[PDB]
Design a protein around this ligand. Structure first.
Ligand SMILES: O=c1[nH]cnc2c([C@@H]3N[C@H](CO)[C@@H](O)[C@H]3O)c[nH]c12
Ligand SMILES: O=c1[nH]cnc2c([C@@H]3N[C@H](CO)[C@@H](O)[C@H]3O)c[nH]c12
Ligand SMILES: O=c1[nH]cnc2c([C@@H]3N[C@H](CO)[C@@H](O)[C@H]3O)c[nH]c12
Lengths: 262, 262, 262
C-alpha cells in the first residue's frame, strides 16, 4: 500500500529532521545538483536510501540525498536526485518520494528537470516554467478508479509567483516519454506537432501523484540541450549535466526566491 | 486458455439463464447503470463474479451484474459494468466478458461508455456513435501472430440501423487511453490533432477482441462531460455518473429500439 | 546481462560456422524469406533456436534460421526471421539477435521488414529506405542510464550506398507500433499527421539496440500493402507474405548488391 509506505517514510523524516511537518518539497533533477546550496543552510542531510520505500537514485547527476532546509518561513524538504521509470522500477516507487513528502506535510511540490528544448525561442541554459504536460508513457502511477482531474495540474498561481521573482521566465508544455534512449529527429517533429515545447523522461507521473495526493505543483525545466535534430548535434547526458551546471547559480537563486514567496 | 475460459463462462450463462444461446451482448459503461429499466424486463439477473473468468468490476457506477433480456426477437446479454485496464488486470481479463458473450452466441456487441467530448458540436448528454477509434494504450489484447484487420471495426451496417432509430445521431472517433487520471488540457489539444472527437479509458481492446472473435461491434459513447480544458471546469467521476443518470432513460430506450432492428 | 548473453551466442556462432568473425548482419522480415537465395551460397545454415538466447521465431513467414554467407568481401550473418514484441517476449530477447550479431563482429545491421504504405507515391512491392523512425510502443530495449543518441539512427552513409545500387530508391519514416492487430483507418490518418510514411510492428527496438551497441543501421521496408483505410480492403498477413514473394527476386538482388558495396 503506497499510503502506508508514505506514512512510514514521513515518520522517519520527522524523526531524523526533528521537524514534525514540512511545508514544501523540491526535487532537483539532472543538471540541478549544484543548485542545492543556494537554497539555504540545511539543518539535516541524509541519504535517501535510509528512508523506507526510497529506491536510491542511480543516474549521473543525482546525489540521492534528502535535506531539510528553512527557506523563507517554510521548512523545505529537498530531494537531491530522483529515480526514473526507465530504470525499471514500478511507478509506485517512482512517485513514492512525492507521496512521502506529502505525508510529511508538503502541500506544494517543486519538480525540476532537464529537458530538450523544442520551441525555436528556447536556448540552452534557460529555465522554463511548465504550463502543462503530455504524458506519452502510456502509464499512470494511479491504480483502480482514481479519476484525478489534471486541469490545472501546474498551478497557475505558482507560475505567477515564479514570475514575480523573475518576470522574464517563459512557459512551455512538457512531453514526458519513457526513455532512456533520446528521441529521433522525426519523433521531435512529431512532438512539435503534438504541442510539446520541452521533452524529458520524468516528471509527469510525479505530477499526477502529487495532484492525486492534494498537493500543488510548480514544474521547472532547464533546457539542457536543443531537442534531437534541431542542431543535428548528438545528445549526451554528460553534456546535459554540463549545460545544467552553467545555469546552476541562477537556478538556485531562483528556487530560493520563489519558494520564499509561497 | 482464453477461448476455453470463454466457453466455460458461456456454459454457466446458459445454465443460469435457461437460455441455450444469446444473440446480442451489451456492455453498459460508466453512467449507463440505470439505463437497464428502459432496455426491457430481465428474465434473469446474476453477479458477474459468479461466472468463470469474470474479474469483478470495482469502478464506481459498475454493478458487476449480467442480465438476460428479451429485446425484439433477440435474447440479449446485458453486462452491467465492465473492468478496465487501469484496474491493473491483464487484457485477457478485460476482454473476457466480450469473448464469453461471443461463446454464448452473440455475434453483435454493443459497447457503450462514458466519454469526454472534444469536438465543438458535442454536448453533455449527447449519445455519439463510434465511427472508428484511436488505440493510444500501446497495448493489444491479442497475442502472437493474430494479425486482425480493423478496417470496419465499428460496423457501418449497425450504425446505419442506429440512425434509423434516431436520424439525428452523430458519429465520432473515440480515443482510448490507459487512465485512470483524466487528461490534461494539453493532452486534449493533442488528441484533437490526432483526430479524436471522444476520449475514454476503455472500449478499444474489447472492440479488437470482438473483431478477432468474429463479432460485429456498435459503439455508443455518452458525452458525460466536455474534455479537459474545454470549459476549464475540473472533471469528476461522480459528475460523470450524474450526467449518465440524467440521460439513462433516453439511452436505455435508444438501445432497445436500435437492438430490435438487428 | 544482455552483453554476456550476446558474447556467448557469438562464440557459439563462431564455433558452428567455423568463421571467427562476421562483418554484416541482415534480418529478413515478413515476406523476405524467399530473398535468401540471391544473397549467395551459405557455408552454414542452422536453427536460431539452437543458439544461446535466441527465442525461436513463430510468425508465419519467419524461418527461424541463421545462415553464414559470403557476400562481396564480407562474411554475412543472415537472420532468416525475427521475433516481435507482440509475441510477448521481453525486449531483451527481441534485440538479442542484433546484439549477438554485434558481438560476432557485425558493425552494420541491415534490418528489413514488411510495412504498410502511407505516403501516396508508395506502391505495393516497392522497397523503401528507412530515413528515420517513430517509436510508438512506449517502450525501449535499454535499461538504466543508457542515454543513447538517435540523431542519425539510420546511417545516411549506408542510405547513400544503397542508392548507388538502385538510384530510384525512395526514403520514408517508419512508425513502429506494438501490434499484433492491424491499424484502424483513423489510426493511419493519425500516423500520417505524425509524419509516418510506413507502418509496422518491429524494427525500432532493434535499431535502438544496434545504435547502443555501436553498429550502423540500414533499414529497408518492403511495402507489402497500403495502410488500412487507403484502399478500403482488409489487411491480411497471408497477403503480406504473398506481396513479399512477388518482390523477392528484386529484394534479394538489391540486398546482395548493396551489401557488397559496404
Ligand atoms: O532531449 C532530451 N530528451 C529526453 N530526455 C531528456 C533529458 C532528461 N535528462 C536525462 C537524460 O540526460 C533523462 O533523465 C531525461 O529525463 C534531458 N534532455 C532530454
Ligand atoms: O473526459 C474523459 N476522459 C477519459 N475518460 C473519461 C470517461 C470514462 N469514465 C470513467 C471515468 O469517469 C473512465 O472509466 C473513463 O473511461 C468519462 N469521461 C472521460
Ligand atoms: O499495414 C501494416 N501495419 C502494421 N504492421 C504491418 C506489417 C508487418 N507484418 C506483420 C503483419 O503481417 C507484422 O509483423 C508487421 O510488423 C505489414 N504490414 C503492416
Amino acid at each position: 500500500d503506497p499510503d502506508e509506505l508514505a506514512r512510514r517514510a514521513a515518520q522517519v523524516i520527522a524523526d531524523r529532521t526533528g521537524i514534525g511537518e514540512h511545508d514544501v518539497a523540491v526535487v532537483l533533477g539532472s543538471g540541478w545538483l549544484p543548485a542545492v546550496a543556494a537554497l539555504g543552510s540545511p539543518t539535516t542531510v541524509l541519504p535517501q536510501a535510509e528512508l523506507p520505500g526510497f529506491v536510491p537514485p542511480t543516474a549521473a547527476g543525482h546525489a540521492g540525498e534528502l535535506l531539510s532546509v528553512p527557506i523563507g518561513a517554510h521548512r523545505v524538504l529537498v530531494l537531491a536526485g530522483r529515480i526514473h521509470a526507465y530504470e525499471g522500477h514500478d511507478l509506485r516507487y517512482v512517485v513514492h518520494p512525492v507521496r512521502a513528502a506529502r505525508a510529511a506535510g508538503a502541500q506544494i511540490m517543486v519538480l525540476t528537470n532537464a529537458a530538450g528544448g523544442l520551441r525555436a525561442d528556447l536556448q540552452v541554459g534557460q529555465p522554463v516554467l511548465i504550463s502543462d504536460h503530455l504524458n506519452l508513457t502510456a502509464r499512470s502511477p494511479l491504480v483502480g478508479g482514481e479519476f484525478v482531474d489534471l486541469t490545472d495540474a501546474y498551478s497557475p498561481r505558482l507560475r505567477e509567483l515564479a514570475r514575480q521573482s523573475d518576470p522574464q521566465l517563459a512557459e512551455g508544455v512538457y512531453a514526458g516519454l519513457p526513455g532512456p534512449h533520446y528521441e529521433t529527429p522525426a519523433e521531435i517533429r512529431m512532438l512539435q506537432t503534438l504541442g510539446a515545447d520541452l521533452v524529458g523522461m520524468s516528471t509527469v507521473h510525479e505530477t499526477i501523484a502529487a495532484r492525486a495526493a492534494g498537493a500543488e505543483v510548480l514544474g521547472v525545466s532547464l533546457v539542457t540541450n536543443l531537442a534531437a535534430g534541431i542542431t543535428g548535434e548528438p545528445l549526451s547526458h554528460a553534456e546535459v549535466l554540463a549545460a545544467g551546471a552553467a545555469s546552476a547559480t541562477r537556478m538556485g537563486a531562483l528556487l530560493a526566491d520563489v519558494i520564499a514567496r509561497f
